[PDB]
């Protein structure tokens, strides 16, 4: 059993929580405490490989932690993630894409750029904006709803992919 460590980051109320709910326990949670972080594990076979995957799901305070750096050191793959409905979740990414770029040193990590709440009507960040960002890191978007399960198994297992295109597992 390979073990792959994931670390799911984005403002506050973009999903983080309800997309690992999704992948980790099949259900939609509609008001998850905004203040509990947690790693939390699921066992899945990617490409006929059993795989456990580690997953932090981030929260609490914004200024610069020092043993945030620690378990941003040890992650191997980030779900960057925004809201289609949050313009400024989506600006956030740029920020959230500089600091891990710093803590691992590379402009190489493996990062998959997600877009949630695919359900809600009348989206404020079109495709092309998070397509234009996703291509000029380098990095795949994947749209998702937590609400629908939409893209969720993709967004998850891209990243594992994405993991063992920079390493081997
Ligand atoms: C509602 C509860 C909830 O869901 N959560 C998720 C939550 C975690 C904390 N989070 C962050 N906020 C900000 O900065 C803020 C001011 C500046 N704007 C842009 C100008 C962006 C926002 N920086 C963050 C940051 F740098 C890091 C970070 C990274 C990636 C890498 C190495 C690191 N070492 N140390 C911090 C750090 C991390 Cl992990 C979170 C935030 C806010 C959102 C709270
Ligand atoms: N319509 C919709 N609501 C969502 C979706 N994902 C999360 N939510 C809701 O958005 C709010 C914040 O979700 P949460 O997972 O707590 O976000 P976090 O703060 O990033 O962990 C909650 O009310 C969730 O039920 C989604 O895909 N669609
Ligand atoms: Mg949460």
Redesign the pocket.
């Known amino acids: 059993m390979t073990e792959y460590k994931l670390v ?1 980051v ?12 999704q992948l980790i326990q099949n259900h ?7 203040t509990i972080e947690d790693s939390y594990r699921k066992q899945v076979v990617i490409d006929g490989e059993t795989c456990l995957l580690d997953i932090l ?1 981030t ?1 609490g305070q914004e200024e610069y932690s020092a043993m945030r750096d620690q378990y941003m050191r040890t992650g191997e793959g980030f779900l960057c ?1 925004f ?1 289609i409905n949050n313009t400024k979740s989506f600006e956030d990414i740029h920020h959230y894409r500089e600091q891990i770029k710093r803590v691992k040193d590379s402009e190489d990590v493996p990062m998959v750029l997600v877009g ?5 009507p009348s989206r404020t960040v079109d495709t092309k904006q998070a397509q234009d960002l996703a291509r000029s890191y380098g990095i795949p978007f994947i749209e ?5 399960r939409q893209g969720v198994d993709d967004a998850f297992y891209t990243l594992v992919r994405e993991i063992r295109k920079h390493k081997e597992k």
């Open positions: 799911v984005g403002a506050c109320g973009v999903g983080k929580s309800a997309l690992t709910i939609f949670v509609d008001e998850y405490d905004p799901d929260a993630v809201a949630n709440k695919s359900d809600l998702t709803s937590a609400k629908t």
